[model samples]
Target: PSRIADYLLLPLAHVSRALCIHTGRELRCKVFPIKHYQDKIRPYIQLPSHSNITGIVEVILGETKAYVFFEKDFGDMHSYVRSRKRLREEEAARLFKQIVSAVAHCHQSAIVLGDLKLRKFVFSTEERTQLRLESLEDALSCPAYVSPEILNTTYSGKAADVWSLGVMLYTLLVGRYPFHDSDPSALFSKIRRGQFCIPEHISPKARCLIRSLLRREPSERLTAPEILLHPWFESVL
Candidate 1:
């Protein structure tokens, strides 16, 4: 749906790498300096397609920027979860299933889903069943999802990614973050300690899934396939 040469591109806050535009049609473009990713198109085209992950519709080159286009997304996951307070078990399970399958596919392809952020996953359209990672590019960081192992040791891409997934899952069902503190030092300390509370409202199976992903030791946390098989998903599927 892109006729880049003609349509007016309105800048939407210039968040993330650079200017992002809503074409007033259904297409959205996130623009960044070509120097930032000269081979960006190649990578986009290279990534194998999956139903849950948004694929780049078209990549257009400008004088200095690359217009990375996607079918316009409704909004980020953070906004959706925040506005609603929290989701019921059935609701969280449905959306979370789509989410993990996408990440699971990425990890299956050996792609390191590093710097996982809630904002990256957006509702694909006005219809809410669709969830897609908006872009492969890195953007804002969410400290709430940072795993304890990341604080003290070498990075293990898949382990950290699954840990973030659990943080997202907990927030989806609980409304507020699983771990919180007013002070950055204390907040990180809490995260490093790797202890978090699950409200009485959460189900036994949901709690089990969360525990598996957030284990302080990387090896102890469930890997991608293991998480995709978590009992909580049994009800979701």
Candidate 2:
């Protein structure tokens, strides 16, 4: 067994490896041995094959750990964005379409991504052209990319996904978050009011699309399929 930082991956006799994630047995009282993974994540692992979502080769359960198996990946979107700063409009459009397609597939299969962010997507190859949504082990955690309703009260699953998409697109175009603050309260307030600036450098079509997805009212936000048909994606599609 070889340990990589906090995560441990053991190379098996076969060609594959297993990533063992510690769940802390003491903390397993509520769900009893990774129930969340069983209920929420296993289905995704078994989903009909899709290009834009990562595939889990197999899962092995131990007393206090879960061994997840997968092929190699080219880091994640968060690191990619950090290195590149921002993508060109054409490149951003292409990646955004792939993201939307993956999310749409999940929604179509009655799965709701409780959390959505650039960090949750990984590139399958060194070229970084192929992206895949990662596992949802921490989906319940609230983050800056989360929608206002999600932070304040009950939120629509699909709408929250759209709101996250808007934030991601904004970051891709503007190289920063739309609503960001060191103070959680300040950030939540800004998000609740839907206060964000579309820089003059961003194209009008891109601005329109971002506005369409970032609406405070869940019902008012565009569906993933609708976003696929948006004018901004027309050229790229």
Candidate 3:
């Protein structure tokens, strides 16, 4: 925990606080900002297992300096958002298709579906998780990535997934999160309030798409398969 500063955040002073932390010596690290899962996925429709970053952390920080220090030599892959900073309409649309497909797959899996392809989903003989709200107080990591309604058990995972997609897409095209706050509670307040500003510069279709995804009424948000048919995708790819 202590070393995380040396690795990820200090680089913020030296750079845009993006990635490739370079501080220590032989105890070096390489962070690869993976764009998506090999199975193909959402802009960030993260599964219980899938993660955006590919790297090990033994408690250190230079988020991406290691990425750049190694000459970005991951042989892994470049992040579309990190490398380009932002995306064009066509690029964002095509990329989003992958994510929506992943989301649909998960939604389908949540109910019933075709047999799992190892490439598309991870499997286990049997898996069980303890999901009591109390057990997860310390478990929350990506607060912003979570939907405001997550605290209520009355909601289901499917609806929350759409909210995450909105946050991811807004960040992708608008170049920043819809809500920003140093304090976690403040952040949660804005998200729960369901208010955020989008620049008029965003394309009309994309703006409409984001509004649909980020709606406060969970049931009103676009389901994964529905997202695939959004006009933005039709207009572009």
What lDDT does each candidate get?
0.74, 0.73, 0.53
lDDT of 1 by residue, 1-237 (tens): 223553446554552222234533445566678866565334434467743476566667778777766666678888888778788898788888878877887777766667676677888768787788765452112679888877787677898899898899888888878788778998898899997899888888999998888888888888877777788878655
Top candidate (TM-score): 1
Cα distance off (Å), candidate 1, residue 1: 18
Candidate 3: tens digits of C-alpha lDDT, residues 156-216: 6687778877877887687667878889788888888897998887989999999999988
- Over the stretch 82-142, how does candidate 2's per-residue lDDT look in tens digits? 7788778898998889889888888888788877888888887679898888764421114
Model 1: how far residue 46 lies from native, Å: 2.1
For candidate 2, list the clashing residue pairs, or say none: none
Q: What is the alpha-carbon lDDT for the whole of candidate 1?
A: 0.74
**TM-score, structure 2 vs. true:** 0.78
Cα RMSD to the true fold for all candidates: 4.7, 7.6, 14.3
lDDT winner between candidates 1 and 2: 1
Error of 1 at 40 (Å): 6.4
Give TM per candidate: 0.82, 0.78, 0.55
Off by over 4 Å in 2: 1-37, 50-52, 58-67, 136-141
